[PDB]
Amino acid sequence: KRNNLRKALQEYAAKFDPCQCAPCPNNGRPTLSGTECLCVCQSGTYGENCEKQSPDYKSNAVDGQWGCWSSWSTCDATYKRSRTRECNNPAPQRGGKRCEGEKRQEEDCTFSIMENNGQPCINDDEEMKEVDLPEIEADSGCPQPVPPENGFIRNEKQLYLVGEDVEISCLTGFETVGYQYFRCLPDGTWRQGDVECQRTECIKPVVQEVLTITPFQRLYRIGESIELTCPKGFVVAGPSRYTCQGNSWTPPISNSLTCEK
Amino acid sequence: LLEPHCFPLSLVPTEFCPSPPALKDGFVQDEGTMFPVGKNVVYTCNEGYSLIGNPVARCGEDLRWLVGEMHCQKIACVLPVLMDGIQSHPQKPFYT
Amino acid sequence: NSDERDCGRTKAVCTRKYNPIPSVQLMGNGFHFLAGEPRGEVLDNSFTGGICKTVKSSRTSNPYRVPANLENVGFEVQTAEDDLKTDFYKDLTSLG
Amino acid sequence: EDSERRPSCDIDKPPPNIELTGNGYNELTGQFRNRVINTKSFGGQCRK
Amino acid sequence: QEQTYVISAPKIFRVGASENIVIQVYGYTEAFDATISIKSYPDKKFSYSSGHVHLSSENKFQNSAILTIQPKQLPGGQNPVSYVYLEVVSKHFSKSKRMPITYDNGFLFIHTDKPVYTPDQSVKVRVYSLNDDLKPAKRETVLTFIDPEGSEVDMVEEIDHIGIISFPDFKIPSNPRYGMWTIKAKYKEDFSTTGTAYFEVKEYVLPHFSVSIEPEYNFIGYKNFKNFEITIKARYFYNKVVTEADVYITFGIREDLKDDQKEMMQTAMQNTMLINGIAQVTFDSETAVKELSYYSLEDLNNKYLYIAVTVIESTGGFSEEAEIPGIKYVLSPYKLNLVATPLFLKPGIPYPIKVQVKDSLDQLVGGVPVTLNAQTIDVNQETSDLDPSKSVTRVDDGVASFVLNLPSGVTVLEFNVKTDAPDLPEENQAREGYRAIAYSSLSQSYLYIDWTDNHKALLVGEHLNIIVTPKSPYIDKITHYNYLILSKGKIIHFGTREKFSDASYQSINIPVTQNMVPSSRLLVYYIVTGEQTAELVSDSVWLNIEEKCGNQLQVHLSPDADAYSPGQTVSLNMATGMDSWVALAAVDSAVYGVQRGAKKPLERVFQFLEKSDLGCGAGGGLNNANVFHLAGLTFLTNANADDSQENDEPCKEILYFPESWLWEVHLVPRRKQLQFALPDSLTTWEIQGVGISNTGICVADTVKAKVFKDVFLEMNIPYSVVRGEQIQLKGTVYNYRTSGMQFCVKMSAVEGICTSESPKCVRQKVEGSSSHLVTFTVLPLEIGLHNINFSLETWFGKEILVKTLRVVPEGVKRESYSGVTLDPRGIYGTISRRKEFPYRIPLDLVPKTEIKRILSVKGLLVGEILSAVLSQEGINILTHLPKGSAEAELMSVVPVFYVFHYLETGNHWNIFHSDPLIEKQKLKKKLKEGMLSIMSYRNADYSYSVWKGGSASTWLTAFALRVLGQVNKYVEQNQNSICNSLLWLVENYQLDNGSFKENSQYQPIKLQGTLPVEARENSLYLTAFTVIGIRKAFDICPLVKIDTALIKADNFLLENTLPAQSTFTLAISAYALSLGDKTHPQFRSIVSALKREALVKGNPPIYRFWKDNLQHKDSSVPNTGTARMVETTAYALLTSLNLKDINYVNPVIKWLSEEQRYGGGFYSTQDTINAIEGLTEYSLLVKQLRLSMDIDVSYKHKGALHNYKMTDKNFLGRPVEVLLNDDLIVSTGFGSGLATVHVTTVVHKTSTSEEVCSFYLKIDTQDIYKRIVACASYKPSREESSSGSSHAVMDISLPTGISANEEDLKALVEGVDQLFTDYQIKDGHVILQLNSIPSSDFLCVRFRIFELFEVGFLSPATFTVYEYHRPDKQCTMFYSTSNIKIQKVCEGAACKCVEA
């Protein structure tokens, strides 16, 4: 409702701004009621709409007031639009003031990408939740299980239905031996498939800010090998060549081949 | 449109379809002297027949019946395609 | 009154009766910039916030209460404009 | 009931001619005309 | 208000039901018309039905219209219409009101040909299928099988022609889960209408005779804790009492009706003889409790007794068994509740009050006194208090009843009711309190129905005669009252009832017509006027009506007889009052003896048919609105009420030898006769006839026909047998002659079931009215099904039992699963659309056995798909903001490539009014101009830049590579230029320990690029963006040098994203890495961290956002913080879509799809691009998952096996038996979507020839009541010494009613040479726990046994063990106490036999 009231204020302003009045005599500010203009007089001027002056009205014939915006000019090369006001309502005469405030406006040219289906209800505080209370689990299904070591779950719910099933999967080093699905029973238990990920591949280890290694491959099949290397002219620590052991290599990762380059 | 009772009213209809079409071995389950625009009528088969397809027919603003291409099937088994030309001893055109 | 629909011993209200600040609801009317005038009550300057904050206009006055919408108020009399302009013309003629 | 009735407000007094603000008006005779708005519907609120 | 109206209608409209709507008008004296009408909501566009009705003095200004919503005329869509408008228009008035609607129309009574089935059976089932108007429905129906584990197993459909729908005979899958399978049924039309029934798969033989245990009360309390009395009774299923049976009772402590395994008194095992049908049993519960329980005082329990009984035919061999589990011990038994009692008052008319009482595991207690107390309030909180009163419950109807007469101004009542009996310590005697209120008429105008609300029924067609009295200040104006009779949901009758000159009214004089029969409800109303005001006054009452059908279908066997005989031809006659269909079923009464307490299959059909009452309770109400609402109506009236002020509650106010045959459906043209053979089964046949016709459903009284003969054999052949074990088949010859006789019995058997008897009996004598044990001993040498013929060869004719035995293998059943998802598009990693399941054969196999395999398919449906689209405003995206300097051209052209990919991938043409072919071609040209344009920003170095005099930009180089990557999927550019530009980037700006720094441009582009991850570490934004360009381009220039550069750059991006820089960093880096190996470890870690950063609205997430920098400001004009959101969200969305999960994506797409932070982001290229890419990749994932997959299964060498046509119309395939001994290829065509397919392998495995046994077993039974010795030894691995086995749990099973000498067994605990720690008896097995076992020798252990012999057939006892420290190491052997004499053994898979 706030945003709509901003939009409405702009449309209301464009429609009812007092700039569109004929200029009020004797330096009065124009004011516009939605139907008519009335002149807010300067001290020492009087009559219905500031027509007549006190005998002390020296600085007679002095004038100056701002005028209406020109309708938005089409977008520039940085996709900004602009509008301007000329300060000619009337322009300052016989030493009257400059018009106050900016004579130009600059606005981005954003537009509506996606289809209109009516405005949603948004409330200032409500969006906040990152992590939150558990729902009751009144569906009597099964919450997302803990997958096994080096595991994964191929599609994630909060809670899965009775009799529903889930596929586990193995991280890139490994392949499934045994039955890779679990199934939700009528009480929230999961009928955990008899399964274990077996290694077939290994991966370039974490190393220091000087490479200390040559990255031959994305993955290394078990029985292949990886090499620690110096960029130039020295040797420091760790094996020059290493082969993978069903576990990772036991590679040097607290320190690597940090040679005197 | 909004406040109809606030004005003089023709609650009596002034546009009607022609009488609804017949079916083989079936009939319109309701009847009248006239059938106004927008009126529904429904088809039902005679005894021992079953109406396949949607039974429902509406007098459209076109002054003609929207219909579903409905079909009165007889409530009897037909003999299936003979599994290997085998003798089906009580051979008949229909089996109740 | 729905905060007080049914209650036991209610919490301690500020002890004496006190009046509100002079014209305090004008501080809570909305202003219409294009017409140059107030239009409608927008802030509730009768609201007391469950608190007893108060301002003394003079040693001579009773204390006024401050509504919770106001951050500061003060009564220091000033003369932000003062203008006196006067002119005389006199003429006397005698002919013989 | 005397227990079901409650004080709706401290006070019962409107601004001194608020009824004249709910009158009608005739633009051609310029006269005020009889009561059109109920100016004293307190809406269950103690608006002092 | 002198002119007024009421329209009255059902609380809910049922779609497809002929709803009848009454109108009444008042204060009118010239005739007019109205059009009661049903219209679409909100829009009022579509009239679903309208009726036009004339209101006149001749009609007494009352009428009705019959209106319906045709199911097909509703707009349908993904979420179904829940509301509709009921409107009236007339001269004088119009109004309309929102009416809820429901898709529950009519009834699906599933009927199954038995309550129980075994494996290797199939389940003849049908659905009686009737409308809300109770006529035959004729709607196509789907019926669905749910396993006991809740997993669905098949679906089947058939068309309805008759109101009877006979489905294909579902065969139980080749290895089932036993237990309560469920059948659900639904119309595959615009109706919900779920029906359900149950059936239990179990491994059973039909019982020989009925056993019943019947207590004096369903609880033990003060009255009986000293002693309790219970009746054990038995009849053969030929309706004859048992002559003489030994009976063993047993009593257990039980803690919960759900389940337990709790223990029992080992004394108090009371034994007796049942004679002439009965034995009387008494339990001195105090004695056994105080002597053996934990408990010594009654106060200690609000818990359960379990009573179990074995009945054994004393000279008859059959044994049968029962329990009443859950006879509760309770200290306040008598819970109370009202029945039939409105809780609304009237003066003068009596206020009847009725209460029932219940046990735990309830029955209506019925033998009890109860007392009532009441206080009454009238004027100004004035009070008067009534005399206490007493009543007694009816021993059959369960109610106890009270009636009250009350001061003429009683305004509220409160009353209490408490139990009143000798056994009541009153603080522990049950009570309840209630309140009741007057009708609360604001006008003090009332309508009291004089009726007495009776629980006793009115008879069909009888004249009901009810008085109704309208007491009112304004009786001058009540010239009539009006009434409505409501049956099920519908106003079935309506009328008007005029004032006589005596100031009394026409009574409600109506025949109770057939449309009322389960129950009906009367509502009565009037509108009256004051001087100006008006009030709708109403009252309502429930009417119980007689349970009589309109078809009146009746059945008898026409050869009327006391008993029929085996194989007899008989004639069955069906008679009916109208032309009708009829369905028949026959069941052996012994079938209902398997499932304890099972129903009749169509039990209480009229109750289920009563659930269609939209009202609830016995009548009355707090006000007019509450009366109509509790009556199940709603109304439109100008007379100052609207039931919109009321809302529902989940209301609870209360008011050869077959097992089955004759499963047939027939037209009965008022009379029909069928002729058939009764079977050889000497048992009662229950014949149930269900009639269907235009008057509704009827169930005829169940015909019982006895099949009986003076002499017959019956045989207790068990349900299955272990191949190579030798068993006693036992039975008995019955003699119901008055004379004795001499008889014989002989057994004929196939070669595969060998015997000691070497086939001539004793020709033994028997008495009249008596029976004698029959015993035969056999070893089933071969598995499968086999005939064994027992024949009597005795006087009164040849009797042959034609009988069959099942045989199964000597080993433990182990089940091994296998399966794959079938994915023809590589949604979850690589494409995989074929799998080849091995015909493996393990080592341990029971020698001659056949391995079994079963295969079935689960279609994984998509779930809800959410609409998100670009508008015709999409034209503004294409016809972009201008060409201009610094490549405002670039900013103008990049939108075109994205909008084209969106319009293409979603086929979204016809967003215009134009021809799609024209628009596609027209757009394509503009896209081509874009190609030349984006090439125009290229250097001859194959760099790109924002100005020709501009220095090189890696950012624009990556960006151009990304965008051109997108287009080449559809329209080409030369690979050489791309490859050169890639190689330029990968040569010049690839780093190490990081990658792709940028050459310090004059400015970041003012509305292109994005706000960087500025202050440090902007390398993460650059690396991600550059990797994103390369991963979109690599498919159009695969090069080892480029690939190597990603092998660096991905790894660096992983190795540096981890410390949670501001989330936009994490989001773009996650998206970049998500194009990579989606199953690398740290990528999942990064993904998880991104998920934790989310923001959501709703209880579950309805919307999901992301924010990086928490710039909390509003923005009706989308300042650049809006871009950081829309871009960080789009990267998270695109990360999620790359992992392919609609369930996570859906609330994000909602977030994108709305005003939110307004517009196309900050209208940057980068946000707007990524936002349209969101809808694009989403519309792809939507179709990627969509199921349409013709899965074809064949053996590898052998032929085809099946073709599952998986579809959005049907997601599920019945298991197919994988019959053949070959590898199985599952395969599919391309189609769409993702499914999974499972094969389960069943095998039976040996103990001695397998790795399961560490501790090898023997046992021996010898006479020296008897004694038994087990002998067994451990087996170490080849590298290990004889240290012995780990700790173990050992089990000595015993045949039921055999018992061990426990006080001898104590020596195994008490002895100084200790081995076992402890022992227990559990499930009738003996358990003992053993610290270790010698491998040096066979540990031998001996015990002694006594027999309270309990059963005719004894299952083999297990001697068995498992290691407690190694519980997978399980070993078993089978043995029995009885001596063996059928024996021979060979060095082969099948062998001879000899007699000992």
Ligand SMILES: *[C@@H]1O[C@H](CO)[C@@H](O[C@@H]2O[C@H](CO)[C@@H](O[C@@H]3O[C@H](CO)[C@@H](O)[C@H](O[C@H]4O[C@H](CO)[C@@H](O)[C@H](O)[C@@H]4O[C@H]4O[C@H](CO)[C@@H](O)[C@H](O)[C@@H]4O)[C@@H]3O)[C@H](O)[C@H]2NC(C)=O)[C@H](O)[C@H]1NC(C)=O
């Ligand atoms: C257990 O008890 C059951 C009781 O049912 C025994 O089942 C019966 O077993 C007998 C023997 O198998 C079987 O007898 C045949 O019945 C046929 C009628 O359907 C007869 O036509 C048939 O006679 C023919 O075969 C005889 C040899 O068996 C010949 O001697 C005779 O001439 C006939 O031969 C002519 O016809 C046959 C076809 O039948 C043709 O091939 C020849 O060329 C020639 O043209 C037998 O009498 C009964 O049918 C079985 N039960 C019934 C009647 O249903 C079961 O055997 C017992 N089983 C055991 C071992 O316990």
